[PDB]
Amino acid sequence: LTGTGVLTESNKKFLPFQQFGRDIADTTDAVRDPQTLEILDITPCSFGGVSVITPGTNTSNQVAVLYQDVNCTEVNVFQTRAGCLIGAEHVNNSYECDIPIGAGICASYQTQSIIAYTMSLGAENSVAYSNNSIAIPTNFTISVTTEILPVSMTKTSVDCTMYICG
Amino acid sequence: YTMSLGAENSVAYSNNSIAIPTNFTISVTTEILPVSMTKTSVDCTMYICGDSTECSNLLLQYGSFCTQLNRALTGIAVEQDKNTQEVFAQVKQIYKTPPIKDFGGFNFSQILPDPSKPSKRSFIEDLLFNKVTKFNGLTVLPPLLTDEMIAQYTSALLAGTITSGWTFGAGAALQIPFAMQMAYRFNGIGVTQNVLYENQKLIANQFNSAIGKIQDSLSSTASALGKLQDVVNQNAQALNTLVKQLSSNFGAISSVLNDILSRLDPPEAEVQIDRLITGRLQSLQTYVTQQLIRAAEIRASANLAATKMSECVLGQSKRVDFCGKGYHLMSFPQSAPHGVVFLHVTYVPAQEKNFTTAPAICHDGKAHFPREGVFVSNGTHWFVTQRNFYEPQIITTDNTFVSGNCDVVIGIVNNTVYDP
Amino acid sequence: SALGKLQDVVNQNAQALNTLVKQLSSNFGAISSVLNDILSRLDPPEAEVQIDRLITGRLQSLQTYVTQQLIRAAEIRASANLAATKMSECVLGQSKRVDFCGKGYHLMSFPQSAPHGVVFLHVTYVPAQEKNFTTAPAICHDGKAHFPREGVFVSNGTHWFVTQRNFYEPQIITTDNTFVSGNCDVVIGIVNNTVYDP
Numbered sequence A: 001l002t003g004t005g006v007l008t009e010s011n012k013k014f015l016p017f018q019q020f021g022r023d024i025a026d027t028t029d030a031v032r033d034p035q036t037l038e039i040l041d042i043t044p045c046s047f048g049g050v051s052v053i054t055p056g057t058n059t060s061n062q063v064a065v066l067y068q069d070v071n072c073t074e075v076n077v078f079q080t081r082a083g084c085l086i087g088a089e090h091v092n093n094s095y096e097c098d099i100p101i102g103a104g105i106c107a108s109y110q111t112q113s114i115i116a117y118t119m120s121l122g123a124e125n126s127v128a129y130s131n132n133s134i135a136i137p138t139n140f141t142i143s144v145t146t147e148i149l150p151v152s153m154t155k156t157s158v159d160c161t162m163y164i165c166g
Numbered sequence B: 001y002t003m004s005l006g007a008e009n010s011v012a013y014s015n016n017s018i019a020i021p022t023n024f025t026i027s028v029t030t031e032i033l034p035v036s037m038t039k040t041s042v043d044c045t046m047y048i049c050g051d052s053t054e055c056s057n058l059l060l061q062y063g064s065f066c067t068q069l070n071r072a073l074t075g076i077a078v079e080q081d082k083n084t085q086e087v088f089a090q091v092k093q094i095y096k097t098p099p100i101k102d103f104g105g106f107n108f109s110q111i112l113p114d115p116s117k118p119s120k121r122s123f124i125e126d127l128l129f130n131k132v133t134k135f136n137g138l139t140v141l142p143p144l145l146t147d148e149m150i151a152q153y154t155s156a157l158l159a160g161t162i163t164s165g166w167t168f169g170a171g172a173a174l175q176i177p178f179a180m181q182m183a184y185r186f187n188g189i190g191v192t193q194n195v196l197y198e199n200q201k202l203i204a205n206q207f208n209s210a211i212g213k214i215q216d217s218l219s220s221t222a223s224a225l226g227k228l229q230d231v232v233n234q235n236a237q238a239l240n241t242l243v244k245q246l247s248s249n250f251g252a253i254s255s256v257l258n259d260i261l262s263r264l265d266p267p268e269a270e271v272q273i274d275r276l277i278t279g280r281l282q283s284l285q286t287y288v289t290q291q292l293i294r295a296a297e298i299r300a301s302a303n304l305a306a307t308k309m310s311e312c313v314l315g316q317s318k319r320v321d322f323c324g325k326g327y328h329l330m331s332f333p334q335s336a337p338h339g340v341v342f343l344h345v346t347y348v349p350a351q352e353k354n355f356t357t358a359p360a361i362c363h364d365g366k367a368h369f370p371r372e373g374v375f376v377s378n379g380t381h382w383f384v385t386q387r388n389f390y391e392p393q394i395i396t397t398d399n400t401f402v403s404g405n406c407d408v409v410i411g412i413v414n415n416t417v418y419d420p
Numbered sequence C: 001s002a003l004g005k006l007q008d009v010v011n012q013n014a015q016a017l018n019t020l021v022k023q024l025s026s027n028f029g030a031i032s033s034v035l036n037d038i039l040s041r042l043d044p045p046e047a048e049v050q051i052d053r054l055i056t057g058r059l060q061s062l063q064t065y066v067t068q069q070l071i072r073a074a075e076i077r078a079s080a081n082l083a084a085t086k087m088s089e090c091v092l093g094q095s096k097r098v099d100f101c102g103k104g105y106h107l108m109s110f111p112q113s114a115p116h117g118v119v120f121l122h123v124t125y126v127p128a129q130e131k132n133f134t135t136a137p138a139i140c141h142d143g144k145a146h147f148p149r150e151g152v153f154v155s156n157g158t159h160w161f162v163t164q165r166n167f168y169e170p171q172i173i174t175t176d177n178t179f180v181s182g183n184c185d186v187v188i189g190i191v192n193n194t195v196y197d198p
């Protein structure tokens, strides 16, 4: 039984006859040492997606790295509900989300260096509510907003025969 | 059994009879809309050729399938956060309620945030969250907005809808007493302002009791949130099935890869691995296609939810059944895992009375029509009253306008118009 | 970047073709990504197997492309139906649907063509300067309660006026601006003032 993983002392209540156990996917999860009456849980070696956070190269070539759904152990560091962020400074001030990461964490490039932060939803504004007060306009403005909407695609056609058996 | 469409009814139609409500009710309906999915992402390479070099070098012969699937899933995951942003981030500012909870007797404590809790959520939001429920390359990407931030957005929208009505959607939030705002919302459905003021305590009590009934309905049964749970289940299946498809053989001698590598030389392990790769790649393509279709479905539902938060919360809709069965007064949002829940407050006439009616009357050979309302008679005297609430008034020239004479109109009748 | 929504579309389709084209350079388990090379090297009995491998791969690629394009066309048709709805309800008319025609009170809209899309210029009325006022839902003249016909009551500190709810145009409170219903023992928040009978 070949594989790759981390073998750890298990707390599984293996029976005297059970040689090893499997997970839902029909893959091994714990084994019995052939030379020792000991059970060992198998955990696949820490892996995880790797994403690159960067402003435009037209601006700078200075970047940061996100290791997804991992701990800052197997790898200016920031632990987040998304993973481990490297090369970005943790900042208390909240700003508009420029480069989204996750769990409310967004990043940007500012005076220079790259920063990560908890994104800000918007300006706080309490309202002077009372049962005898009303705010009424004395003036106005004529605003013009732009709304873009796709309507049509490229009328592509393909000859299956010529594509395959040209 | 053959099912019953509904209780049959017959409307007492007649050319001189009209039923008018003498009373009303304030209904609060829950509309649940799913908004987002689980931002799943799969490493096609690791799913097909986990920790195998020969397998990956064979997989390269199929080209960009790996990358194309990853790209599609990334697009889906971005679309989900975009949907959430479109729904909840319809407001630039984060409005807050004052400590003075003087809303004319209206009670919002069961939908406003509970500040004493760690998560700044409401009682009903907590109910909704509590009524809803690996190593093969499959990962779950966290959403961009945390439930706490979703709740902040909902609180902002709620506070705006309360303190300022619909103004915070058009532009700057303009404070106004809640009762007068409801008077506007009544005048918007053909009911006069006085009705609200004269029935203010009753209306507030009905509203609060409706909110309590919402609490009871959501605490008792969970089926109400099916439209959300279903989604989750679907995705779960689409994942489980996928994982299960790893345990199959697809014509090969084994469903495992290292076992083949530990039994055969390249010249034949290549063929077996080709079979496995074809099967697993086809499974991945099926999963991605089903997920794209489901994501389109969720995008439609999210755009609908955004339109509702615009025309329903940020405003007052005259569209029918778009914002609860009834005449729309307003609505309040409440977040939920991967979705939103609108509480639509609507005006439902409840107590109706028969009255004889007439499109017009005759005073001096001229014909008088009602400016805003209809003419009615209980049997002896004629009145003019608004058509969504029985508030009879004396017929005058201030309540009517003249047009033509009585030799033309059909169904016209006789009575005296008082001139002040 | 304002037109990203449009350009994005183009880009996607471009990929969906370039990708497709690149999938011709792949062997899919065959000996060579070129059909004529196989024909010029092998006899039918084995060239058929290799060609069978290539055909499977390329037909699968075409199926993927077509499925993606069908889904993207569903999305684009949804966008187009929305745009037609916007032209009908927003250009040819004046919509009271909030934020369907831009953030504000919709006045009107003007269409403009664009590559594979349309652009709406939404003219809206946005209140800009706001003044505080002490208000009230009614007033008491002679034991009767006067409500506004179309507007709301306000106070600048000393005198009471009646004005429309979205523009400060104070007027004198009369019986031509108000209507009467009930008395002053019922309404909440009511006040006292003088109503001028012309």
Ligand SMILES: *[C@@H]1O[C@H](CO)[C@@H](O[C@@H]2O[C@H](CO)[C@@H](O)[C@H](O)[C@H]2NC(C)=O)[C@H](O)[C@H]1NC(C)=O
Binding pocket: A138, A139, A140, A141, C128, C129
């Ligand atoms: C309402 O606001 C507008 C602008 O928002 C004011 O218009 C200004 O008028 C002065 C005098 O002619 C000009 O110098 C400014 O340039 C105008 N502003 C703009 C943006 O064009 C207008 O005076 C305001 N009216 C009231 C009653 O407040």
Ligand SMILES: *[C@@H]1O[C@H](CO)[C@@H](O[C@@H]2O[C@H](CO)[C@@H](O)[C@H](O)[C@H]2NC(C)=O)[C@H](O)[C@H]1NC(C)=O
Binding pocket: B022, B023, B024, B202, B205, B206, B209, B350, B351
């Ligand atoms: C309209 O219907 C409502 C709903 O039943 C009535 O409200 C009740 O009024 C009585 C009289 O004060 C109270 O004892 C009840 O507690 C009220 N119910 C609720 C839910 O608030 C109302 O009386 C009806 N009005 C008319 C004119 O018939």
Ligand SMILES: *[C@@H]1O[C@H](CO)[C@@H](O[C@@H]2O[C@H](CO)[C@@H](O)[C@H](O)[C@H]2NC(C)=O)[C@H](O)[C@H]1NC(C)=O
Binding pocket: B101, B107, B108, B109, B110, B212
């Ligand atoms: C708004 O409604 C809530 C729930 O119906 C009220 O909360 C109750 O308040 C009473 C009196 O303070 C307590 O005895 C109950 O235990 C509360 N129940 C819950 C579930 O909190 C609240 O009081 C109402 N608003 C006001 C101003 O009274």
Ligand SMILES: *[C@@H]1O[C@H](CO)[C@@H](O[C@@H]2O[C@H](CO)[C@@H](O)[C@H](O)[C@H]2NC(C)=O)[C@H](O)[C@H]1NC(C)=O
Binding pocket: B378, B379, B380, B381
């Ligand atoms: C129809 O409406 C008229 C007017 O509202 C009613 O006439 C009233 O009758 C009561 C006694 O029943 C008198 O005290 C009032 O002075 C009458 N009002 C007027 C204006 O004359 C009439 O009774 C109603 N008929 C029915 C069947 O309800």
Ligand SMILES: *[C@@H]1O[C@H](CO)[C@@H](O[C@@H]2O[C@H](CO)[C@@H](O)[C@H](O)[C@H]2NC(C)=O)[C@H](O)[C@H]1NC(C)=O
Binding pocket: B362, B413, B414
């Ligand atoms: C309503 O009143 C009008 C006006 O008083 C009535 O018109 C009369 O109709 C009768 C019958 O046709 C004629 O003989 C009279 O000459 C009409 N009046 C005049 C001034 O010429 C009408 O009949 C009444 N209708 C009802 C249903 O009461």
Ligand SMILES: *[C@@H]1O[C@H](CO)[C@@H](O[C@@H]2O[C@H](CO)[C@@H](O)[C@H](O)[C@H]2NC(C)=O)[C@H](O)[C@H]1NC(C)=O
Binding pocket: C156, C157, C158, C159
């Ligand atoms: C509130 O409005 C009232 C009425 O517009 C103001 O009283 C008027 O003040 C002007 C200017 O002195 C006088 O010419 C009028 O004669 C006053 N009204 C009457 C009926 O005579 C009052 O000053 C305003 N208060 C504030 C604080 O602006």
Ligand SMILES: *[C@@H]1O[C@H](CO)[C@@H](O[C@@H]2O[C@H](CO)[C@@H](O)[C@H](O)[C@H]2NC(C)=O)[C@H](O)[C@H]1NC(C)=O
Binding pocket: C140, C143, C191, C192
């Ligand atoms: C508006 O005017 C009415 C009528 O004068 C006031 O109502 C009186 O209030 C006093 C003080 O409580 C009572 O003794 C009288 O019996 C009331 N009269 C009536 C007809 O109800 C009312 O207080 C005035 N409003 C304000 C804010 O002062």
Ligand SMILES: *[C@@H]1O[C@H](CO)[C@@H](O)[C@H](O)[C@H]1NC(C)=O
Binding pocket: A034, A035, A036, A037
């Ligand atoms: C051989 O394996 C058995 C397993 O029970 C163990 O007891 C014994 O010590 C082992 N001997 C050696 C030389 O490793």
Ligand SMILES: *[C@@H]1O[C@H](CO)[C@@H](O)[C@H](O)[C@H]1NC(C)=O
Binding pocket: A058
């Ligand atoms: C870089 O960006 C600036 C604007 O940010 C632009 O003016 C310039 O032409 C760009 N140059 C290149 C090489 O991209």
Ligand SMILES: *[C@@H]1O[C@H](CO)[C@@H](O)[C@H](O)[C@H]1NC(C)=O
Binding pocket: A071, A072, A073
């Ligand atoms: C990261 O590692 C530490 C140390 O083992 C552990 O306590 C912590 O829980 C880990 N992170 C998460 C999110 O579990």
Ligand SMILES: *[C@@H]1O[C@H](CO)[C@@H](O)[C@H](O)[C@H]1NC(C)=O
Binding pocket: B012, B352, B353, B354
């Ligand atoms: C009105 O009259 C019809 C028949 O004339 C009757 O069926 C109906 O019940 C009446 N309405 C009420 C509220 O009783």
Ligand SMILES: *[C@@H]1O[C@H](CO)[C@@H](O)[C@H](O)[C@H]1NC(C)=O
Binding pocket: B015, B016, B410, B411, B412
């Ligand atoms: C209404 O119907 C009755 C019965 O058919 C008839 O006598 C009367 O003339 C009709 N009135 C109108 C205005 O149609």
Ligand SMILES: *[C@@H]1O[C@H](CO)[C@@H](O)[C@H](O)[C@H]1NC(C)=O
Binding pocket: A128, C130, C131, C132
């Ligand atoms: C109206 O009053 C409130 C407090 O009562 C204040 O916050 C607000 O700024 C005032 N409006 C203006 C225009 O000053």
Ligand SMILES: *[C@@H]1O[C@H](CO)[C@@H](O)[C@H](O)[C@H]1NC(C)=O
Binding pocket: A130, A131, A132, B100, B102, C188, C189
């Ligand atoms: C309005 O609110 C104040 C407190 O902010 C309160 O004293 C007053 O009684 C309220 N008015 C009414 C009519 O309840």
